[PDB]
Symmetry: D3
Subunit: 267 residues, 6 copies
């Protein structure tokens, strides 16, 4: 199994890459004009310790820029430019017209830095939860960067964490507002079930053992206790664990530090 | 002068908001079905100390969701839910069909959290540079989140920092690769000037007083010393200042923490 | 609960309507020129017995054409222009510039006819399965019309049938190809689980009680016997039932007859 | 002459295919992950008697999925998996990474089934009209599936039927509403002619020999009698013929049965 | 009859306007920031003698900029700021936030100038052909500005000229290449007819009375002699007329001078 | 340095070409059907004296049409089919399926004709200004054809002229409206500077030596006198020069004649 196989050979994500490029060049690329098209070589460097993530995305950036890339590491690999010999690590060798390389650069690096950042912070928490004996799941949230949801969720998976529900059409998530609207948890679940059906799970945010039970018996698939079936707890970060099912946290993705990368031509 | 006036009454950014919404609802919105359309009220809360940024963007999210919003604070205001009475601060009151509110929620909050995060980290560094007596500029970089460049740069401005060049068509940025390509700084500048013209500035990354001088005399508009005209230094973060012109740093935007926001219905 | 609440106040589906309109007018609308903009009245007729479906979609067609519509029946209602007095039934009254009405016409009718057709054929089979005592689900398939998936699935729901999985990112569906690839059902399920996680169900097409059992124990959520958990059988149409969980059929949607509608101006 | 030559080497239709794919994979393709990329072989089967239509479209689906296809039959060929040896007929052999094949599958089959269905029902009626001695035209209508007009009209042609006017910018179609608006048929035609010009035909729906004559003399190109030049009659289905010019019917396309296809990997 | 009724209330053309706006503001509108949103008044001036064309287009520019416009002249009117009192003529009064006005300006003026230019040059030639007694048609060509075809053809109509065929799907245009391909004019026409059908005209470029005759008898709708039915001659500009049917010229649209317009705020 | 290097290997401009093609073929290409796919040869001719411009654009048209092109002249070359031997000049040889050639034709020619027209008129004025001894710049304007800005500006550069500011986000352009809004030139400049920053120039339209001075001292980068820093004068065409900095004119691009091109197949 290879993570990049999650991405469809063709689909919207590739168009996203094209749009990211247009975002950087609205009219002309003056630098490309001065630099020209002589064939060049270049190395893509990792300058900080962390997991390598975002390969297929950066690869797509390089393909549309008509370059030849050779990846020295598999996506998911844990890089440690700990060696101060340089403090850097070549993760890919690139070849192509000078201008194409420089056009690609900033976009590919912006993808890798952030993708690697989410994967890394993801790995750290699942390695932490795992090191206590906990056998459950650590999930992310829907508090993703607008327009970048595909990439961030993907980065969560490579890091070893669950993604939780992708969107609002994905797994139903019921709360008080919904329960108050239908008059009861049981009613909220019945209506939710009537439209999502058997193929999609229903989750209910409960505030008491009585809340949960009613949900359980309405047929809810997941139960979130805050403040047959699975249980979830969510609210906080890298710090509560018990032999329960789900712990969600936006700390793995939202507002996380980045893993620094750089790209320089040979000579 | 009002920052939101930077955004064109109509243009691509509004389409970005629609796409951000579609990203959250690819097929149906089951929750909207259970909750229904009864008119509701809700408050948008700020749960952490920082500057409020992203108003026009979140406002656009609310407009497309056909809601009525009342903002209690001007964008740019420094919020301090320091008072533990609640640890929160209502920055806007919203009204509209229950489902519309819940559809809007996650997107608007994801905009505000990140926009406020960049503005805040931006304000902290310019307030810091300013507090030493430095009279120059603190700028950002092109290491922005793919697809979110408009919002992040905008957030930089509201925070009190320069944005630097928007893209590759914006201000010309010459380096060794370009200089090596044309044979000299003077040649790189001549070619750069020939295509960008008088309306757009040319910047050159120099590594010596001789490098700079030649650039100065080629006619470069900005000079970056690393490692008539303006001078720039860039590489590091919140820590070197001297009565010089430009200090760039991706720390104001890239991989920065977020300012937490929440939204809950009345009853 | 109102079905149309499944559609997000704003999102891609509304853009689909605009594209459907452009599809009918690539350059000019000569008829609109001759007819002009005088305000007119018109009735939307149902000419065949069946369930009314597609309201929010046709409504969106009418909104973009700047018209005023009054629906005489709730979506989901079973219409019977059985009365030969006319053999027709007015389901909506429309008002607006003559040209706008005529532009709207063909698109709205093409939506209603097909949407009503799927809903009707859907209602007939669930009413049939229900009339035998069967207490389970009748679902649809992914054999939908390219580009029209949102509308057809929506029509399935209004008719009283399940939609089954929306797409490939929705509920995992494993088969022999996958099982052969990983070496075993157990392995196929483990890999499927590793990437979809807890929020999304996994279904396995089994050909024996031993196939199923292994899937059950791998943790599959649904099992399809062809040729804790739920069971599914799929292959045929309006004709096998037993007190089991799921029966899927493309007969409810694919290649189904249409429910005839017409629209004429008053005088 | 080859029908597929009607499609421009590049244009919107290819983008439609990409959108149809995205429609099936909004976020990840879990199945593609489990199945992997090992090169595989597969056969595309026809399981029902009818005409093969939709080749260039399904071919485009296969090209974007980076596969190698070998078509065993020319588009337009009449297939008869009448032989119960299998009741199936291989119409194409495919090769490529397992996941790519499975991604392609449902979309290509949904194209073929419907395209073949329209072509078949089209061939049946023109073969029927032809078998009586009728030397005229059998046309379709604008009651096409929203967003799928290009494919359905194309399927009409391959089947041997006319498409009639593509859209509202295509051939002018005047009616009572228009005639009432301008005060007379003669006036409606004059205005229609003034904007469409010589390159585009004008058709008028007449209800009497006097209606027609005035249209004829206004210069209308086609006349529809319902209830130099050409005459048309339209309203009903597979059942009135006389040595006249045009008979239109939505029965050839709208709400027609589908021709079943399937695709399975080798081993 | 009003020309603007040719444009569909909604469709692609309105999106074109939005794209034209985005083209002018890729990131921020600094001027809008300095100018602010105070309500202002402004006049749209015509500075050269010619026909007013492009109203609905410029109106759409103004609507998306949320302004209030009052047109003092009907589209099609012949303006003569011949009076040197000012040499200008107010054709519309506008009101709205200062910034919105200034954003709109350049786009609306670029539409009007060119639209008015094509209409004017169109009127001049049809008034010229008409003044000799010629009772036929003066048409345009497909040599239109890429991406601006809708607007230019529309401008042709308002000027009093035919548009000729809109595109390649519009009226069939056969030539030697086609005739050589099928072996004969008769064959080229048969194949053309087989795919376009009765609703669309077929034109043939003939080089002899024998060429024409064969086309006539193949059933071609139009015949172009260069170098029942209609005849066409095309090649040259404002200068050959005889009581024949069609004279085409790109001089009415391609590379034509523009009609100068300006827009200034009140005080 | 090669001008075409200004265009990014991939970005929006290539999508513009696809849209230009779709604009010509909304449904089918009947001519392509009759002509077929036999491999053919063809020559692209220049029929009027002027500079060759638009190569990368026409090349992109040819690439998407899957053709093989051989350019006989470098973009920027001054062609003179002055020789009446033919009055034409082959600038490129093309090979590919007959239909693909004919599909490409009109679009590529419409690009070249206009691109060459702007370049030519651009070269004529800079050669004129240059021939007087003037050592400054001749610039264009923002009065470009809606949707075609990239191509026209690009054509300006190849011709030897400046493009001036690309858009409203490009170089700030202040006027009376802005100055009146902020109360003074000094204030308008301060606000403009506060949002555009150091990377983008600020220009001010001054009407007196006192106007200019205040702008100069506010820090404006350019000053336009109409009716350290650079000076500009703009208003008129091919006719005032003095040893000053900038002369802008829309005459180089807007409403300029076209350079005629043609394309014919070999035999
Ligand atoms: O961000 P974290 O603290 O990790 O918490 C993540 C949780 O937040 C969400 O609640 P919701 O979005 O409804 O309320 P919120 O916006 O106040 O977090 C949902 O409960 C997530 O699982
Ligand atoms: O991220 P920061 O450390 O604040 O530095 C920002 C600087 O980085 C950029 O260099 P470039 O992108 O060419 O090299 P890099 O990728 O190694 O930083 C450019 O020099 C920016 O001003
Ligand atoms: O169309 P129906 O006969 O109702 O059957 C529907 C079933 O078809 C599908 O199988 P798949 O698509 O893998 O094989 P197919 O194409 O041969 O039906 C899947 O099994 C559906 O549940
Ligand atoms: O669907 P069919 O019965 O084959 O008829 C097709 C005819 O329908 C159309 O009329 P129009 O769409 O104006 O009226 P309608 O919607 O009542 O058919 C037009 O007359 C078509 O040629
Ligand atoms: O531009 P004008 O001189 O008015 O001529 C217009 C004519 O040009 C076209 O021929 P085609 O485009 O096939 O050959 P061309 O490119 O050489 O004009 C077609 O014949 C037009 O009616
Ligand atoms: O078209 P030209 O005469 O060459 O002049 C070009 C000048 O026009 C513009 O003014 P603006 O657009 O503000 O006023 P206008 O529309 O009246 O020209 C700006 O001043 C340009 O540099």
């Amino acid at each position: 199994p290879v993570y990049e196989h999650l991405l469809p050979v063709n689909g919207a994500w590739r168009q996203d890459v094209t749009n990211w490029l247009s975002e950087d060049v609205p009219s002309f690329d003056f630098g490309g004009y001065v630099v020209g098209s002589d064939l060049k070589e270049a190395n893509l460097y990792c300058k900080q310790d962390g997991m390598l993530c975002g390969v297929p995305f950066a690869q797509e950036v390089f393909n549309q820029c008509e370059l030849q890339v050779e990846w020295l590491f598999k996506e998911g690999s844990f890089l440690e430019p700990s060696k101060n010999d340089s403090g850097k690590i070549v993760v890919a060798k690139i070849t192509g017209p000078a201008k194409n390389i420089l056009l690609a650069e900033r976009t590919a690096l912006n993808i890798l830095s952030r993708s690697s950042g989410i994967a890394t912070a993801s790995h750290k928490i699942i390695s932490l939860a795992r090191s206590t004996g906990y056998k459950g799941t650590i999930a992310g949230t829907r508090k993703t960067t607008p327009g970048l949801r595909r990439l961030e969720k993907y980065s969560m998976l490579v890091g070893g964490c669950d993604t939780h529900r992708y969107d609002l059409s994905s797994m139903v998530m019921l709360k008080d507002n919904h329960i108050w609207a239908t008059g009861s948890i049981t009613n909220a679940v019945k209506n939710a079930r009537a439209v999502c059906g058997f193929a999609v799970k229903i989750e209910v945010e409960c505030l008491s053992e009585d809340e949960a039970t009613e949900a359980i018996e309405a047929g809810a698939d997941v139960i979130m206790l805050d403040n047959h079936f699975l249980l979830e707890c969510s609210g906080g970060l890298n710090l509560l664990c018990d032999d329960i099912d789900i712990y969600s946290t936006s700390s793995i993705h939202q507002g996380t530090p980045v893993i620094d990368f750089s790209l320089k031509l040979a000579h």
